[PDB]
Each structure stands twice: as structure tokens, then as C-alpha cells.
Design a protein around this ligand. Structure first.
Ligand code: NO2
Ligand code: NO2
Ligand code: NO2
Ligand code: CU
Ligand code: CU
Ligand code: CU
Ligand code: CU
Ligand code: CU
Ligand code: CU
Ligand code: CU
Ligand code: CU
Ligand code: CU
Ligand code: CU
Ligand code: CU
Ligand code: CU
Lengths: 295, 295, 295
């Protein structure tokens, strides 16, 4: 796009603050930012806050979100749809024009691990170019396995295609399929959808821990067969809803936009790959690593 | 096919009548009928009753169906397989030759939302060319959320490929992916798998209602990531069996031939898109709309 | 590969023996063996024991497996990952060099129907070339429907691509998609992933029986929409874990590496096709038959 040539807007931190016992303000940007998705390969991504997937958002079940989008894009409108919320899409998920802001308010009344993404037509173009992320809604009553979990991380799967190519987006296999991790607590990694960072800087854990991953497959196009090598999921909550409780799964099927909370024990020191078991995607970049040490 | 050149047989209405407290007669045709699947694009479909997907069939759990197929096709045999039924496929799902009729009888002893389709080899050819549809079997004891539902519709997803091209059917991406809606009660829309009708004439509902959709992904080839923008499914029954009960899902994973009953509340006036969240398919036509008014 | 030219190593039988009330020894080979995947089409497969998928392994919940791999391949390293086990992947799923042996030990503490496969990079290459199979872990307390089942078989789905072509493995549609059956008890068929054997020598059953299938979709790349024509699954246990219990499903969604125990009644004599309902795959070979006789 001519107005995007040479544009690379520095990442802006997410802003969020609680404004009542059940209300939270959230302010994100829409911005065009170079991301290295594979070694030597820069995708000039359409992003929230300069990250793809965008920044993690976490609220409590029953929170109403007062959401502000500041469109830094010089020429393309953007918008936001959170899958967490009940809202009127033709009122509340509408476009914010270049160099403008818009504020929308809506409730998050269901617990889980929800995709969010731009809702601007063509939505496929916006998601593929990098406008996706996850919002976690914490159940008012937690999960029944909460006492057993020792450590937690968030992982997101997404695809990357040929650069802003709608033909490829609709009809082509993905060029890369990738994991990223978004921070829940200080010290957690916070990375972008690329083929390498979570291999070279693996997630960390300690021998014997029960790990929880909040996961979502944001697509745009592919389903995910989520698997952690060398373990079996003790407990899985589809879409992160506590009611949806499965046990002893080797692999979790995730639709496009599909989330889960999975929990597994790592019993031995060493490095545990984390994959989509659709191995063409795994080979095209969708392998993270978890390093488990006596530390 | 030479005998299909210029053939466009007018749609014939489904016939069905109850003949006992647990027996129902059903009579459908197999016919070759031009359907506009996208603006300007006519697919000379292989159809039941001149619709693709075919007409909706609804029976009660425990009903035995006495099924008659009248093959109006001048040259191609057709047949019918209902996924609802227990039957001998090599006896009961057999071909009916051109210009002949055949009657088969079999029980529907499980509740849910079942695909039906032609069972004539190559089955891929018959389904892709348009020989698919849904039969709903109503649970003897309803669903536990029945009292909460205010309005119901049926939606079906299917793909369309290059015209009667077996190479494309087996190896090619779909050209279109589409929703249609089939009527449950007088006044309900009854449409065909196309890219536009449910956008231009959206399904209707009223602010605050709990909506139930009986859905099925008939394929032939793709899985579906079913999602309704601006809401979360309060309750989902996999394959429409009341036992298979999930809560608070943002998106429902549907295999090829996969069904569900999903229920969600629309809280605000406006237009709610309904998608497969595999966005390449959504962009190739698989977006329906639900218009929610203070009416 | 030059060292594989003209190599066709005769299948070697699986070896397994119990060595304690909760310990079992297992010894498999890695070997290069010509398999006919379709009529006239020989794939020089990378295999365990000369079968693709490899031989069936069955242990009891709580068994520790002492596993030996003898690499007969003249030049390629191989390894083994069982999805059943808790293990350190970077210690326990490591390569065995040509003409060497390696022994690894790890527990199987969860019941179900688990994929196993080579864990040697690129893992996609190893699985696609034929290094996959299933290990069943029998629940300590069986399934709640055990008393109702009259007959059991194992079925595995896998794909075959152009011969050792990593580009095709990653980016290409499968050339064949196939079922095979592995023996649970003397007299059961034991076959390889091909387009024809289970059509020409169908599985056998008797009118009125409840059949259980232990199934797994090993991929490498595709999800499976598993369906048995002319019946509905009475009971399904996702991943073969008794807790994960669904009822009355027409079709079961299986991710890549995904397993299940499904149970269905055949009510009438005749031949029942067994498919992935993603019909492009079915047309490319993924149809088995079950012949049901008054015998
Ligand atoms: O299980 N992943 O190689
Ligand atoms: O834009 N569909 O959620
Ligand atoms: O034709 N398979 O249901
Ligand atoms: Cu309060
Ligand atoms: Cu506010
Ligand atoms: Cu955007
Ligand atoms: Cu969405
Ligand atoms: Cu009666
Ligand atoms: Cu009759
Ligand atoms: Cu037909
Ligand atoms: Cu079918
Ligand atoms: Cu003991
Ligand atoms: Cu030993
Ligand atoms: Cu190997
Ligand atoms: Cu694996």
C-alpha cells in the first residue's frame, strides 16, 4: 500500500485500568509494524499495539470492558471484535477511521480463553495481516483443578501468508504456522508469532510441576491439533469454560478461533516440544519448546 | 453430461405424512436443477427436490421412516443415506435407476441433527454436485434448555467446486463456501447454498431472545468452525444429542457431516454475522446475518 | 536415497513380553520396506517392523514400558515417541543410529488409544514416510459399556504423499488417504495403510452385535471425520479415556494424532462402509468395509 511504504510504527504498550469492581478500561492502538516472522523475513503487519498476535488482555468474569481503539494507520480503517463479549456487532464492533479513536462498551459474562480480532471487511485480510490476539476471562469460581497447578503460560497459534495477498489468503497454503507466548505475570516472555523465538528461548518449568496453558488457535484458516510431547493432558477445559471438562487427552482439537485451558505434568528433566500435530504446519514453524530443569 | 444439457427441472415440494404414532412416509425426488450459487454463477446441481442442500426433514425419536426416492435424472442413478437411521447400507441405501422409484424403510432411534446425502459411487461426486441435506430427529424428552429458547432456525454449511470436476472435488480448494437456511415453521426462510441470500435477507430475531440453531456442516470436504459474532453459545449439544452438553463455547468445531444444536442470547439491537471462523471459507461466501430488532 | 536403492527389508514380528505385574518389554525395529499403498503403487516406506502404520502395541494402565528400538536402516537415524507415556523427550525419545539399538523406559499411566511415531527431525518426514502406529492402554476399570460389546477391532487412518518429497509433505494435498486394521486377538486381520485391502477383505461381524472400534488418526497432516455408514455411535470415549464420554454421535472429529473408542450396533445383514466423511480423502482411498452376516 503506498501510504504504508517505509512505515514501521514502534510498539505502544497496552493500557488497562480497573474503574469499578466490575468495570475495566482498555486502550489499544491499531498500527503498522515490521515483525520478523521467520529468520530474514519481515512482514509489515497490521497489528494491535505493534504485536502480532496483539497484547494479552485479562479480565474477570462479569467485568464490563470500556474499550478504546486509537487508529494510528494513515489510511486503513480498523475495528475490534472480542469473542468474550455480548455486543451488537453493527454498533459496537465498528470501524475507527485513520487518526481517530472510538470507544465501545460491553460485558464479559462468560469465563474462558477467547479470540479477539479486527472486524473490518474483509475480515480475512485484517486477521491474516496480523489483527488477532486473546482475551482471558477468569472464572468467578476458578477451575476445580486450580489447587494442583504450579505454573501457567499463554500460547497462541496463527498462520502467515504471502504479504497482503488476498488470493493467497483465500486459496493458498500458509507459508508459516507459528506459536507465540503472551505474559500473565512479571517476568513471563512476551513474544510475536514467529518460527523461532520459543525454540531458542524455551518456556521454563521445574521437574514434577503441573503446568497450565491458556491456548487459542486464532487461524485465520487452519484448525489446530494441539499436543505437548512427553506428556498427556490431565485436564482440559474447552474454550476455558470450567464446565467443559475432559481428562487424559493426548491432543486437543481446536477450531479456528478455538481456545482451551490444558493442564499436564512434566515428570522428567529435559526439553518438551509443543506442537500442532498437523505436521505440515509444525514443519512450517509451529513448534514451541518447554525446558524443564531441576530448577 | 450430454443428457443434462439444457435440463433444469422445476423444484418439487418434499412430501411427508405420518402413517402411525411411530411411522412416517417421506417422498423425495432426485433431479437436476439450476441453482445460482453466487451472483451470476449457475451450478446445474444434482439435487433432492430441486434444492441444494435438499429439503429439511423432521421426525421424532423412535419414528420409522418409509422413504421413497423418485429418480427424475434422465441418466444418472441416485440413492439416499440418512445418517439418522440404522440400516443395511448395501440393501437400504441402494441406487434408484433413472425414471424409477424405490422405497426403503428404517428407524430413527437417536435424537439429533443428522446429515443425509446420496450414497451412489462416487459418493464425493454426488455430494459435491449438491446431494446433501439435514434430517432432525426431535428428542423424546426435548433438551433441558427447551424452556429458555425463544426462537429457532436451521443452518447448513456446504462447499461448491468447479462444475462436476472430480479432479477439483478431490484436490482443489472450494470455489465457494456457503450457508443456507431450511424452514422449521410457516414463515421461516427456505434457501439454497449460496453466497448472498442470508446476507441480503438476514434471519430475524428480537432483542433479548435466546436463539437456537440446529446446524450441520455437510462438506463435502471441509470442517467448520462455527461462530456467531457478538455472542457466546450458552449451551451446545454435539450432534444434537441432549447428553452431549457443553456450555459457554465461543466457536463450535464441526467435522464434515457434523451437527449441533447451539443456543445463544442476543442482547442488543443490530446485525450479527454468523460465520465459519475459518476465514478463507468465510471470505468465499460462508457468512449469514441475523438481524435483531426491538421487534 | 542412494543407500535405500533396492532395499526392501522383510517385516520382523513385534516382540513384547511382560516382565512384572506393572512392567512390559517391547522390541521393535526401524526398517525400510516396500508396501503397496494402492494397486500398482509401491512406497518404499520408513517403518517400524516392516508395517505402516507399525504393529499394534497393547499394555495396561500403570504399566512401565522398557522399549528397545533396533535401527536396521543403513543410513537414516530413527527414534520412537509413544503418546501414552510420560517421558523426557530430549532424553527418552532420542535417535538410535544405523545398525545400533537403544532402550528407553517410561510409564503408561493414562488409559486410551494413543499415536506413536518417530521423533527424529524432521518429524514430518518420518511420519509421512510411514513411521506411525497406535498403542492402546487398557483402563484399569474398563469402560462402563464393556458388558455390551460383542466384537472389537482397531482401525488407523493415515495419508501418503509423493515419495519422500518434503515440499509435497508440507504444501501438497495427500495422494492417498487410507485405513488399516491391526490385530487384537488371534484371527484378526493385520493390514497396512492402503486403498484396498479393507474393501476387498472386509472386517466381519454378526447381525445385531455391538461393535467397538479403537481408532486413531495418525495424519501426518489431516483431521478425520470418522463415520460408519448405516449406524450411529451409541457411545464414544475421546482419546479412549473412559471419562470423556459422548453418546449418539453420527461422526467423530479426530485431530491429527487423535484417538477414540467408538461403539455402534449393526442391526441388519449387509456391507457397512467406514469412512472419513471428508469425502475427498474417502475418494483418495479412506473407505473400509464391515461385512455383517447372520454369521
Ligand atoms: O508429538 N510430536 O512429535
Ligand atoms: O468475525 N467473526 O467473528
Ligand atoms: O457415505 N458415508 O456416509
Ligand atoms: Cu460486586
Ligand atoms: Cu468507562
Ligand atoms: Cu485491521
Ligand atoms: Cu471472530
Ligand atoms: Cu407409542
Ligand atoms: Cu409405509
Ligand atoms: Cu446423486
Ligand atoms: Cu454419510
Ligand atoms: Cu500391583
Ligand atoms: Cu526391563
Ligand atoms: Cu524414522
Ligand atoms: Cu506426536
Amino acid at each position: 500500500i503506498a501510504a504504508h511504504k517505509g512505515v514501521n510504527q514502534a510498539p505502544v504498550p497496552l493500557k488497562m485500568e480497573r474503574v469499578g469492581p466490575h468495570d475495566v478500561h482498555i486502550e489499544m492502538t491499531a498500527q503498522i509494524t515490521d515483525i520478523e516472522i521467520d529468520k530474514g523475513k519481515i512482514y509489515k503487519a497490521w497489528t494491535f499495539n505493534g504485536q502480532a498476535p496483539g497484547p494479552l488482555v485479562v479480565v474477570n468474569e462479569g467485568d464490563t470492558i470500556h474499550f478504546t481503539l486509537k487508529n494510528m494507520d494513515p489510511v486503513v480503517p480498523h475495528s475490534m471484535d472480542f469473542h468474550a463479549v455480548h455486543a451488537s456487532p453493527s454498533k459496537d464492533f465498528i470501524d475507527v477511521m485513520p487518526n481517530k479513536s472510538g470507544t465501545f462498551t460491553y460485558p464479559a459474562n462468560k469465563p474462558g480463553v477467547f479470540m479477539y480480532h479486527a472486524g473490518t471487511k474483509p475480515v480475512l485480510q485484517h486477521i491474516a495481516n496480523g489483527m488477532h490476539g486473546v482475551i482471558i476471562v477468569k472464572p468467578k469460581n476458578g477451575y476445580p483443578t486450580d489447587k494442583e497447578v504450579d505454573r501457567e503460560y499463554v500460547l497462541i497459534q496463527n498462520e502467515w501468508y504471502k504479504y497482503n495477498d488476498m488470493n493467497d489468503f483465500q486459496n493458498g497454503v500458509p507459508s508459516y504456522v507459528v506459536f507465540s507466548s503472551k505474559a500473565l505475570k512479571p517476568g513471563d516472555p512476551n513474544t510475536n508469532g514467529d518460527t523461532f523465538t520459543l525454540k531458542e528461548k524455551p518456556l521454563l518449568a521445574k521437574v514434577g510441576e503441573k503446568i497450565r496453558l491458556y491456548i487459542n488457535n486464532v487461524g485465520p484458516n487452519e484448525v489446530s491439533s494441539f499436543h505437548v510431547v512427553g506428556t498427556v493432558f490431565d485436564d482440559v477445559y474447552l474454550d476455558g469454560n470450567p464446565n467443559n471438562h475432559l481428562q487424559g487427552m493426548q491432543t486437543v482439537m481446536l477450531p479456528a478461533s478455538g481456545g482451551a485451558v490444558v493442564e499436564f505434568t512434566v515428570t522428567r528433566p529435559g526439553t518438551y516440544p509443543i506442537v500442532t500435530h498437523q505436521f505440515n504446519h509444525a514443519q512450517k514453524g509451529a513448534v514451541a519448546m518447554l525446558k524443564v530443569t531441576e530448577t
